[PDB]
Design a protein around this ligand. Structure first.
Ligand SMILES: NC(=O)c1ccc[n+]([C@@H]2O[C@H](COP(=O)([O-])OP(=O)(O)OC[C@H]3O[C@@H](n4cnc5c(N)ncnc54)[C@H](OP(=O)(O)O)[C@@H]3O)[C@@H](O)[C@H]2O)c1
Ligand SMILES: C=CC1=C(C)/C(=C/c2[nH]c(/C=C3N=C(/C=C4\NC(=O)C(C)=C4C=C)C(C)=C\3CCC(=O)O)c(CCC(=O)O)c2C)NC1=O
Length: 205
């Protein structure tokens, strides 16, 4: 039985928007949780279901996860670099909702800093990185099938589907296009080969 129904968290963000468009075009029945539906586009592929609410509200997350086959997590803080627990608290709610509803597959984006030497995190990104680490811990300890996606710099290059995925943070470059990152999140829905692993997508454009 393959995945047909998915929830995407963070669908209005840079990577989320293209992951959403790609998922719908690929045939998935997609539900999104958004705080502000005006951030979803009118042109192009459209999600099947829109829940208005907040990943910090358990009931909103529960409504989004109910009935799904898998969950994609592309939560982030946009340009806000201050200390934060939004992603990890969101992940706690997602895990609880998954367990309440029998959903067992989550693919979630943090960053390659969780693979690279931690002394290399730029000071300005440390607070967000600390919450990525809390989120990764939550997902790893959940006992669900969890693919940790840890990308380098997210760029605007075209979709290629030709990127390289390593398990250790080394690879052909330190960039992945947002489109290729979304393509990889979707690839993780049709294989178990990355479950329980950390993954590093990168490409030379
Ligand atoms: N930028 C880089 O080069 C880079 C590199 C490696 C890793 N990353 C990490 O990759 C992940 C994806 O980044 P991105 O740039 O695609 O993301 P992004 O543009 O920051 O988008 C964040 C998404 O999270 C949603 N969100 C935030 N708080 C929420 C809340 N309380 N309830 C519901 N949704 C909420 C946002 O919703 P709204 O639209 O409502 O704001 C938006 O959809 C992030 O965790 C980022 O730190 C980024
Ligand atoms: C507004 C903040 C912000 C800016 C302007 C920024 C710039 C920035 N990010 C880069 C890559 C990168 N940027 C990130 C990660 C992130 N980038 C993010 O904005 C967030 C929120 C994360 C997640 C913690 C990563 C993992 C790389 C690896 C790119 C490389 O190795 O060269 C690079 C390439 C090398 C360099 O640092 O000189 C720059 C300049 N990074 C920032 O964080």
């Amino acid at each position: 039985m393959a995945v047909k129904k998915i929830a995407i968290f963070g669908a209005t963000g840079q990577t989320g928007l293209t992951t959403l468009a790609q998922a719908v075009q690929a045939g998935y029945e997609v539900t999104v949780l958004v705080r502000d539906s005006s951030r979803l586009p009118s042109e192009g592929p459209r999600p099947a279901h829109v829940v208005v609410g907040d990943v910090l509200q358990a009931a909103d997350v529960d409504k989004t996860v109910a009935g799904q086959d898998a969950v994609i997590v592309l939560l982030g803080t946009r340009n806000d670099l201050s200390p934060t627990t939004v992603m990890s608290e969101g992940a706690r709610n997602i895990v609880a909702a998954m367990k309440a509803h029998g959903v067992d597959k989550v693919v979630a984006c943090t960053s390659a800093f969780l693979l690279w030497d931690p002394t290399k995190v730029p000071p300005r990104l440390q607070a967000v990185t600390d919450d990525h680490i809390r989120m990764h811990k939550v997902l790893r300890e959940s006992g669900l099938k969890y693919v940790a996606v840890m990308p380098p710099h997210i760029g605007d290059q075209p979709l290629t589907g030709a990127y390289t995925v390593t398990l250790d943070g080394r690879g052909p470059s330190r960039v992945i296009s947002k489109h290729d990152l979304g393509h990889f999140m979707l690839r993780c829905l049709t294989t178990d080969e990355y479950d329980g692993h950390s993954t590093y997508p990168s490409h030379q454009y």
